[PDB]
Symmetry: D2
Subunit: 334 residues, 4 copies
């Protein structure tokens, strides 16, 4: 099975990819990293993390490498993926975490550069898109470029799946109250064409567009076109929550909904359950993609008109990274 990985974009996601691989003692070896900076800066960022603390393994660097837990990782600095010399250390699967290659057309450049497969850490149009433990059985040996969608997708999908499977989702809308991320702004100023994204992220509630509900059909085909939603980006550094308001195909109670969700999270490494009164910092470092929270379930009904609100936590950094790695490990073995 494929064992050698390259990371393009050693950022919030990319660094945590490495951390998680070492944490679970994967047989996958990161042999090369591509970014835009020096091994020194990358080593500093890897060692020191504002959200997860000190790196649990040794970190050193040379003029062209990192040395992590005694093992050498090549560092390249090629801004165009086609130029990355992936063949030098035999990088087979590229974990694409820059945000700049979010299409099949763009990410195939890695193949041109000598890789064999690409797993994109973000939605990437209508390509094969996987939420582990929702539709990873759609992966096969001919899949060369795959997406794991967004963290919000990885949160929304398992909850939507469980509801759809148990009760039917006829139509629904999502709002995720989401930690700020690097696409936003530190101080008020231009941030491409999105006006809201220009505003100081740690000082505002900021409405934000997300494709998680719009594109749910890639992951749950029967919900294709049945969901919409958006985000409110807020001042927490990581840790996020997704609310879904649904018309279901059945009259339900809160307990019935909660029991169905509990069943779907039983023996499920991707999808956790809680009935404790947690808050967002309690999900930081979660090993799930999504944690359904039974305490926030709400059924609002007048006669036969019924709205169902269901809420799941997610650590948009590490929790999501756990999903990307489970997908990666399976990808490497097809």
């Amino acid at each position: 099975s494929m064992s050698k990985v390259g990371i393009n974009g050693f950022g919030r996601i990319g660094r945590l990819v490495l951390r998680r691989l070492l944490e679970v003692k994967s047989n996958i070896d990161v042999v090369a990293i591509n970014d835009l900076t020096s091994p020194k800066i990358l080593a500093y960022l890897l060692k020191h993390d504002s959200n997860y603390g000190p790196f649990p393994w040794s970190v050193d660097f040379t003029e062209d490498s990192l040395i992590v837990d005694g093992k050498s990782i090549a560092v390249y600095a090629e801004k165009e993926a086609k130029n990355i010399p992936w063949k030098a250390k035999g990088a087979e699967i590229i974990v694409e975490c820059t945000g700049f290659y979010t299409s099949a057309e763009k990410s195939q450049a890695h193949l041109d550069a000598g890789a064999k497969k690409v797993l994109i850490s973000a939605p990437a149009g209508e390509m094969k898109t996987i939420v582990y433990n929702v539709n990873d059985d759609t992966l096969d040996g001919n899949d060369t470029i795959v997406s794991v969608a967004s963290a919000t997708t990885n949160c929304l999908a398992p909850m939507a799946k469980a509801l759809h499977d148990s009760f039917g989702i006829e139509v629904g809308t999502m709002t995720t109250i989401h930690a700020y991320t690097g696409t936003q702004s530190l101080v008020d100023g231009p941030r491409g064409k999105d006006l809201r994204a220009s505003r100081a992220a740690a000082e505002n509630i900021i409405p934000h567009t997300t494709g998680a509900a719009k594109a749910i059909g890639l992951v749950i085909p029967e919900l294709s076109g049945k969901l919409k939603g958006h985000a409110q980006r807020v001042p927490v550094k990581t840790g996020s929550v997704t609310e879904l308001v649904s018309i279901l195909g059945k009259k339900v109670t809160a307990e019935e909904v909660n029991n169905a969700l509990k069943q779907a999270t039983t023996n499920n490494e991707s999808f956790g359950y809680t009935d404790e009164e947690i808050v967002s910092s309690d999900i930081i470092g979660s090993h799930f993609g999504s944690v359904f929270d039974a305490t926030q379930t709400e059924i609002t009904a007048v006669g036969d008109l019924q709205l169902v609100k269901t809420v799941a936590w997610y650590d948009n950094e590490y929790g999501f990274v756990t999903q990307l790695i489970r997908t990666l490990e399976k990808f490497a073995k097809l």
Copy 2:
């Protein structure tokens, strides 16, 4: 007619009440303030405000009074309202902003203590409850204890009223993404029996119960029992947003919902409109109770089914206070 007011609880809401009364050059006369502390400390807090900056008028104090814009205000420190000596300076209407007297039974104390009327800055059970420019016409000459509900109620109600009047609301659910408040905790520690309220407010997304939707029937009786909702408390110091997901009585477009709401905000001092891409800091200092945001309107439709998401902003401190003062001015004259 009644012109002399006392404020119980010179807190975030209590101090802004005075600021607003001065700002609009009210004929109402604040003659007394009760709290738990010295004039010195109350004077310091009035003068220097972390959210709204320097107090626009002069402030001084003596051992038992504040002197605000040259006028003397008596200061009392009675922790039981029934002991507050309101007859001394002839306080007739009490603006009750402590959070400790949120029922008719409890606020009866101010009347026993020699006041004539009480206006509670919070929900207070099944009593007359006023959102100005939604149901202020229900205020009556024999009312002696009334509520202005919560800021969230002042945000939700005019949006709900508009939608219901134009389209009918059949059922609906609310989530407010809401600035943290003094009911929460600075560091993790006991905060009565609300476990979530025990958690560090500026470092977490914190689900929180609110009655704004549940008790909406006090303000819009046709909507009794048709709404539920809750809050997510987040790390902004003031400025909040309310989302409502509704099943309406008619099929609609976004443009149609937005035009109805625009008409409802026309010449409406309590309820504003924007189609700008604002964020929470842009609402701080608002003179509305609610500002409907056309940019966030969302219609999700599958077949005969439709969900409608509408969103309004609110300064849960100053905005809400502008509503409290409109209600007080009218209350004072009946």
Copy 3:
């Protein structure tokens, strides 16, 4: 073989909860048998399990109507606002870790001895009493001590830096400023907070000057420096992790390398006082197992003629870092 001292914690707050965490983490021979606070087992269990700064508790937590069950061991829970009413004898708690902020003097903490405990270790400055910064002056403890202080997190950060400088070069005079994470003494929203006007102001929205005795009372820890230091704090919006700057006139003209080498030697094989030459920031100190970490990167010598100002800087996790010092002192104090 092992000294098995029975401990009670008064005030199961930020510090009190981390005291239990840390004792379990190091597999201490101390048994915590009782906790007193102002609330229910249910609420203490919630707070112990979920921590905004340090994440999930590493052991199981449950509660009954009158106890916590932590990793399978029962800890009695009391809620007596007056320490004299705490039934410390019921489970044989002998050494009280006093972490409420309300008994910070010999006369006040006497209440624990009257209620049947034998010794009190106060998690804060407590006036003129034996005041210990571990690995600075813990040799001054003896069998006769019954009530002792570990001073502030700021003292635990200042003292080892000041000791090293004094021993190597002599400090003639100095002033400190700590840029310090906000704590529970401050305010969430603007509102009354005792008599400290500045403490009334929203802690997560302001730089707030704040008085601290860390420098003023340094003589309790390093007698040779009594009266030679002053300082204060600026409280700022980070949830934990703080930094202490000291500006000093030394007894000897120095270079930055010379100051850094001296401080390096002082941190060698020193479980309480760490060193760094990496470009760390406050979140890097969160969860530190040192009372203080000297930062060679911020050393600064300013010199004109024969006049020299030396600025030296140390990080500290004012929560967990300080707690590790508290525990080291607790373990010693319990054996005496």
Copy 4:
């Protein structure tokens, strides 16, 4: 008298420059703005400010300009200053606020492009560097490129000047506890070569080099080489404080220090005084470059040895901008 100005870099400082010019009714006209974006996004940014709230004047835009208070201001988007069409509108003095032209040789490009003078809103090496009400008497009719140093310089300088004039400073070191700015990072990631600048600014105390003290000699020639210092960047959006530890030329008391400072601030529009127990949010919107705070003065004396700690607040955005404008007004008339 020159009165056409162009702003290069319409950022936090650039937009506040225009706000302050309008506020003081300057006879200077901003006729052009260069940035990297559209009029629509600049207009949005001008209108809505996370630190200072809504713009006090009307703001609109066309395809090629802003309309501010009914007056037209051209907008350009030239990355290289030598391409900026300053002559089109006859922009005479360029207020240089991008941070990319902080040297005589770099800001020369504006003069090559047709402007007559340049005021750089930052330290710009060994050039004339003005703190208004400290050394603005050094400006003359022959000057073409000048600096107003940093906000920290505008804070430090007036306090250093009062101390030195009254007592002599023999040596000193500064620490500014300073609001985070746009040179820092929102999430941990590369920010050129400065390792500490890579770290999430709203979640850390971050040491930071600054030359405010190092280069004080350009402003107070007698202190040249007598001061060092640095910054701790912390999570407040604006509003900063500067501490100075000095060895003075005589023995002093705290009362004596504070009276000397009170005196230096009397009828001084650039330099204020306080003995109120203020916090950083209270300095936001200050019309001073610096506000000396008598409550934080501390004298540490051991026989002949004495350390004097003096402290001054500054709004590093708006307050500094008031100083920049004062200097601009004078620069325009020589």
